Design a protein around this nucleic acid. Structure first.
Ligand SMILES: [Ca+2]
Ligand SMILES: [Ca+2]
Ligand SMILES: [Cl-]
Ligand SMILES: [Cl-]
Ligand SMILES: [Cl-]
Ligand SMILES: [Mg+2]
Ligand SMILES: [Mg+2]
Ligand SMILES: [Mg+2]
Ligand SMILES: [Mg+2]
Ligand SMILES: [Mg+2]
Ligand SMILES: [Mg+2]
Ligand SMILES: [Mg+2]
Ligand SMILES: [Mg+2]
Ligand SMILES: [Mg+2]
Ligand SMILES: [Mg+2]
Ligand code: NA
Length: 212
RNA sequence: GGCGUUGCCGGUCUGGCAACGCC
């Protein structure tokens, strides 16, 4: 697979229908096994799926292969996992609601997310039941863990990375100037930047940062 | 088998192994 018949879109892409339907044959198997073993996980990690069956073909074509199958109503895609169309994790109906509400609290809070502490108080939850739900949201890619008390919704993180790219485009920036850019405060921005250092999105040099 | 906790590992976690708890 393949050259550049089942045809793709990425600039076009023949793949011998022969092996396009083998490609989807394996995907159904993997995902059934996975959903079957992990009914409380949102799906197979994307890179696990790729590494497992698609290391062969290049990253931007794999993207399109997922993109098309979702389009055909065959896959449900998340920021960082794939699942089959009608898969539904088996949490209690109370927990399903909690997943919706946790997501919302983090979305609406945006650049000033609550701490885990606050959340557990306000949702009236065991640390342990909260850990299960935060964990699934993290597997799924809906929340991202900045440090032991701050999670960020992925939209909020994505939008703060653009803000940082803008800020850095005029040259190295300080913590205060990043706080200005986000109209936020040092309590939130410091953890954000430390997080972005760790994943190598920014890199810190004295009191200044740049975008790598 | 999952899921949690704790411990241990491998610089690290969208982890791995073991014990324990609940399912
Ligand atoms: Ca899902
Ligand atoms: Ca979700
Ligand atoms: Cl993505
Ligand atoms: Cl992200
Ligand atoms: Cl980027
Ligand atoms: Mg696994
Ligand atoms: Mg933005
Ligand atoms: Mg740092
Ligand atoms: Mg950090
Ligand atoms: Mg497992
Ligand atoms: Mg621990
Ligand atoms: Mg240790
Ligand atoms: Mg040892
Ligand atoms: Mg785990
Ligand atoms: Mg025993
Ligand atoms: Na199970």
């Amino acid at each position: 697979e393949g050259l550049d018949v089942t045809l793709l879109r990425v600039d076009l892409y023949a793949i011998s229908t022969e092996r396009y339907q083998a490609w989807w044959q394996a995907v159904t198997r993997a995902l059934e096994e996975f959903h079957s073993r992990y009914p409380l996980r949102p799906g197979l990690a994307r890179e696990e799926l790729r590494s497992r069956y698609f290391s062969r073909l290049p990253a931007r074509v794999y993207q399109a292969l997922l993109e098309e199958w979702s389009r055909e109503g065959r896959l449900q895609l998340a920021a960082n996992t794939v699942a089959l169309a009608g898969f539904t994790p088996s949490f209690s109906e109370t927990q399903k609601k909690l997943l919706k509400d946790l997501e919302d609290k983090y979305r609406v809070s945006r650049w000033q997310p609550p701490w885990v502490k606050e959340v557990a108080g306000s949702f009236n939850l065991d640390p342990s039941e909260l850990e299960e739900l935060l964990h699934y949201l993290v597997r799924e890619g809906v929340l991202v863990k900045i440090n032991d008390e701050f999670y960020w919704h992925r939209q909020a993180l994505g939008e703060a990375r653009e803000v940082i790219k803008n800020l850095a485009s005029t040259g190295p920036f300080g913590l205060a100037e990043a706080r200005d850019a986000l109209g936020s405060s040092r309590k939130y921005v410091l953890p954000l930047l430390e997080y972005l250092d760790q994943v190598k999105f920014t890199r810190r040099v004295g009191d200044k940062r740049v975008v790598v």
